Homo-oligomer: A and B are copies of this chain.
Amino acid sequence: KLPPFIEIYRALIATPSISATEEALDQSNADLITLLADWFKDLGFNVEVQPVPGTRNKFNMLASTGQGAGGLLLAGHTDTVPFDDGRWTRDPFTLTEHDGKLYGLGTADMKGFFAFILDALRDVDVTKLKKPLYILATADEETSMAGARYFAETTALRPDCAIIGEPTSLQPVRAHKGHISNAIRIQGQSGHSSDPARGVNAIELMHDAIGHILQLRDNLKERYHYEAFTVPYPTLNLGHIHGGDASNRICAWCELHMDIRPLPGMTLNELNGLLNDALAPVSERWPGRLTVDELHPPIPGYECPPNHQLVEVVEKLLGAKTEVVNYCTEAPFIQTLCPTLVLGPGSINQAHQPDEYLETRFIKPTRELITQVIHHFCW
């Protein structure tokens, strides 16, 4: 009943699922979901399609089998980044073999993962599994991660563990930093530069705030360490500043946009705690003039405990040690449901690039890795 691997792959690549914040480029993942939904139906899984609030008509799919607690969650995203038709030298939607490489938009990131899951399940009898098996297909990972966010917020599901099939060259990944973005906003009071003391100069107040923020930057860099990261400390970046009307007017308003990248172990609440603490002497001096607002929904840090049985099994199956990575995944939201690893075929060297491909040599190892992991946590 299930087509062969390359045919499953071909149809997924041929179904456009580009995500974009730009209304013009943003395609519905409905056709991608229907493909996955009908195929998982055919294999005997129950299926739930979920509209995702505040997306342009995007959906999650959960495919479920078995009952009771625990089980394995296999998770991926159905969307791809846009393509540059100027730099692609093949049709992005045409799966093309050439020189041990399979070319197409989402070959590496990450439609291959679903083709491998279905391919691995082709002869498996879901009746005879001891523990539940879940397949999650999320919307809009490449933009808001609204799919994974809305799933982790609303789902009753509580698996024993989860693998998110992002391209890692089949290296298991157990952590990455978070990402919070803030606007620091300072209300001045206007006045003529003929008496620059008559008003409240927002730039002078922002100069004070920046002093305290750079002190926090130094404390973060000095007191929090995670040796496995290339940059082993939580980072703080001043990105943008704007304020004032003219050289000859008291600066009436000033705004600073910054980011912080918290290490896995530090929570969002403690980080907003550290930032309010740094700014406190300034907002106290000046009640009601300094506000801190979020620029973009925050992403928590993620880690999987390094001796978790998920990690030991995977490391042993692949004979590869776990890595940390310098990029954000859905793992922070899936980690609220159960211990989570990031592990998939193909490379971020092809992800989001023109003439994206997945090497065909990933085919046998990936089929075998998924088979072994389903037999380990469901049998």
Interface string of A195-228 (1 = CB under 8 A from B): 1110001011011001100100000000000000
- Which of these, B203, B210, B239, B242, contacts A249 with CB under 8 Å? B239
Highest count of chain B CB atoms <10 Å: which of A241, A243, A245: A241
Chain B residues near A258 (CB, 8 Å)?
247
A214 and B207 form a contact (CB under 8 A): yes
Q: Are B251 and A245 in contact (CB under 8 A)?
A: no
Distance in angstroms from A353 CB to nearest chain B CB is 15
Contact check: which of B239, B243, B327 meets A246 at CB < 8 Å? B239
Question: Which residues of chain B come closer than 8 Å to A210, judged between CB atoms?
Answer: 203-204, 207
Interface residues of A in 165-218 (CB under 8 A from B): 177, 179, 181-182, 193-197, 201, 203-204, 206-207, 210-211, 214
A residues 223-280 near B (Cβ < 8 Å) are 230-231, 235-251, 254, 256-259, 261
Contacts of A327 in B (CB 8 A): 194
- Least CB distance from A229 to B in Å reads 9
With beta carbons under 8 angstroms apart, the residue of B206, B242, B254, B295 that contacts A247 is B295
Which of B179, B206, B211, B238 is within 8 Å of A251, CB to CB? Answer: B238
Contact with B along A307-332 (1 / 0, CB 8 A): 00000000000000000001100000
For A250, what are the chain B residues with a Cβ–Cβ distance below 8 Å? 237, 239
A239: which of B242, B247, B296 is its contact (CB, 8 Å)?
B247
Which B residue sits closest to A177, measured CB to CB? B194
Q: Which residue of B lies closest to A176 (CB)?
A: B194
Residues in B with CB closer than 8 Å to A182 are 247
Cβ B214 vs Cβ A204 within 8 A: yes
Q: Is the CB of A231 within 8 A of B201?
A: no
Copies in the complex: 2
Q: Are B326 and A238 touching (Cβ within 8 A)?
A: no
Tell me whether A241 and B251 are in contact in the complex, defined as CB-CB below 8 angstroms, given that A195-B231, A207-B207, A230-B195 are known contacts.
yes
Contacts A207-B207, A246-B257: A196 and B241 contacting too (C-beta < 8 A)?
Answer: no
In Å, the complex CA distance between A181 and B206 comes to 21
List residues of chain B with CB within 8 A of the CB of A237: 193, 196, 201, 247-250
**Contact (Cβ within 8 A) B231 A194:** yes
CA distance in complex: A141, B363 (Å): 77
CB–CB A248/B204 < 8 A: no
User: Complex: how many Å from CA A327 to CA B195?
Assistant: 12
Q: Which of A181, A214, A246 has the most CB of B within 10 A?
A: A246
CB <8 Å contact, A193 and B259: yes
Question: Do the beta carbons of A241 and B239 come within 8 Å of each other?
Answer: no
Chain B residues, Cβ within 8 Å of A240: 203, 243-247, 251
A241 and B238 contact, CB distance less than 8 A: no
By a CB distance below 8 angstroms, the chain B residues around A254 are: 241
Specify the chain B residue showing the minimal Cβ separation from A246. Answer: B239
Give the distance to chain B from A282, nearest Cβ to Cβ, in Å.
14
- Which residues of B lie under 8 Å from residue A236 when comparing CB positions? 196
Chain B residues whose CB sits within 8 angstroms of the CB of A214 once the complex forms: 204, 207
7 further contact pairs, Cβ within 8 A, besides A196-B236, A203-B240, A237-B249: A194-B261, A203-B241, A203-B256, A239-B245, A241-B241, A242-B243, A247-B257
**Can you list 19 pairs linking A and B with CB atoms under 8 Å apart?**
A177-B194, A193-B235, A193-B261, A194-B231, A194-B235, A194-B261, A196-B235, A197-B231, A201-B238, A237-B248, A238-B244, A239-B248, A239-B250, A239-B251, A240-B246, A240-B247, A241-B241, A241-B251, A246-B257
